[PDB]
Amino acid sequence: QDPARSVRHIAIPAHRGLITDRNGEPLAVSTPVTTLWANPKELMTAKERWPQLAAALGQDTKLFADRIEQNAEREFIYLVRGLTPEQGEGVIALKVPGVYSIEEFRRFYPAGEVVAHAVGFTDVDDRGREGIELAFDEWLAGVPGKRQVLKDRRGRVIKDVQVTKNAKPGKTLALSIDLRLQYLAHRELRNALLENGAKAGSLVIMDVKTGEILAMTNQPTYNPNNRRNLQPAAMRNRAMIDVFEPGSTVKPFSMSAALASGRWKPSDIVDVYPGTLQIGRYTIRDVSRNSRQLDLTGILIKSSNVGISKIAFDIGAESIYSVMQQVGLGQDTGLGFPGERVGNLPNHRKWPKAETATLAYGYGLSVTAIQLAHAYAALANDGKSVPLSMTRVDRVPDGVQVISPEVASTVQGMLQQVVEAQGGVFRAQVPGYHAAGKSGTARKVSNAYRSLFAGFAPATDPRIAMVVVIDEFGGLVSAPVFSKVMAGALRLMNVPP
């Protein structure tokens, strides 16, 4: 026969670490719940109690009985996971032979759908499945404790002996996210999509000094506290996953290369008439074909593919490739979100004219909204790249001077004119401030199109970079979202006009 006595162990679940926004507002909080397990060999001696027990578990009387009878020979099954402590005390109070309790934890997300994708959620075992919860699982999970029990020959717990290992609570995490900006971003992105008959999009706000992600919102979203009817479209962290050719939004990086080459100055003129350029069997065609001479700022205002291609042929694709690589386009973000997409910044030894031109006007690479906001942050931060962070930054990293301060300042002033000049993206203007940026028609890589707006403010002393992505010309839907969210974000951060 089996031993009359055996010393056994039971795990002591650990309290998962608090997630807060950068101002300490809670975003994910461990809620005590009660798990009930049974020894069927003991339960089998108390059948008349089963229907009361089943009703207190919210289980069907016969399905409950069938489950215990089917497991009669086992000494452990779970009865139910994650009752309220009040509910568990009610079941324990029934004193049914063979019913035992374990203290577990369930997450609650106080801000719900507003920050669903960035924070993520946990599975039935309280482990990270999505977002920060996944990326920082090890940090947040802590370490289960251990205690000894004495069991008899039939698996009855006859003594709680001792705790041999204290549970180690998980560690607290303060995100870079500012929930005030996050609520503004979520509201305005949602409202823009509903008003324009669009289904999906994303918005990223970054601190250009610190590399902090201040807001990251995607539509559709979901309530992480009630996933009962959750659609896969809604769980997608689009800002980090959706890859697209960024089109005209990377022409500022092409212009940065041109101004670093020694061959170009802002007052330089390019003739783009008649809005096309034959390069062998290929024709580069401009979206607006009403121009002859354009200065470098006008090439950005008109988004002339011919203009930027002629510059690119003069300076060589390798100069443009290098800037785009150094500002992080097509590169690992280092954020350690499993499944984050890197996109592709193709390289060549010999760049033919076609591939040189498509790189320079943004169809020769694929990026995410995070990478595009990161690149805009570098340009805004007087050309100094700072690592991306989803966590609060107290000591700002040195970062890397990727674009000379002078060139970055000149390109800031060109992008100010894109927003402010006659013929510019006037819907991206931010009353009280100089804003700077560039619209684009992005092409999805998996043709599906996205309306992009990328920019920063204040134009003459930048603090915040922003990318707006609307899945669906001239930012007519993404530019006004930038305008409204930047207007708000700057004042919530007490940025002076």
From Swiss-Prot:
Reactions it catalyzes: Preferential cleavage: (Ac)2-L-Lys-D-Ala-|-D-Ala. Also transpeptidation of peptidyl-alanyl moieties that are N-acyl substituents of D-alanine
UniProt membrane topology term: Single-pass membrane protein
Intracellular or extracellular location(s): Cell inner membrane
Enzymatic class: hydrolase
First-listed, main subcellular location of the protein, grouped into a coarse class: membrane
Cellular component GO terms held in the UniProt record: plasma membrane
Gene Ontology biological process terms from the UniProt entry: cell wall organization; division septum assembly; FtsZ-dependent cytokinesis; peptidoglycan biosynthetic process; proteolysis; regulation of cell shape
Active site (record annotation): S248
Source superkingdom: Bacteria
EC number: 3.4.16.4
Upregulation: Mainly produced during exponential phase of growth.
SUPFAM superfamilies tied to this protein: beta-lactamase/transpeptidase-like, Penicillin binding protein dimerisation domain
Keywords: Carboxypeptidase, Cell cycle, Cell division, Cell inner membrane, Cell membrane, Cell shape, Cell wall biogenesis/degradation, Hydrolase, Membrane, Peptidoglycan synthesis, Protease, Septation, Transmembrane, Transmembrane helix
GO MF annotations, alphabetized: penicillin binding; peptidoglycan glycosyltransferase activity; serine-type D-Ala-D-Ala carboxypeptidase activity
Described purpose of this protein according to its UniProt entry: Catalyzes cross-linking of the peptidoglycan cell wall at the division septum. Binds penicillin.
PANTHER family for this protein: PEPTIDOGLYCAN D,D-TRANSPEPTIDASE, PEPTIDOGLYCAN D,D-TRANSPEPTIDASE FTSI
Name listed for the protein in its UniProt record: Peptidoglycan D,D-transpeptidase FtsI
Species name: Pseudomonas aeruginosa (strain ATCC 15692 / DSM 22644 / CIP 104116 / JCM 14847 / LMG 12228 / 1C / PRS 101 / PAO1)
Classification lineage: Bacteria, Pseudomonadati, Pseudomonadota, Gammaproteobacteria, Pseudomonadales
Name of the gene: ftsI
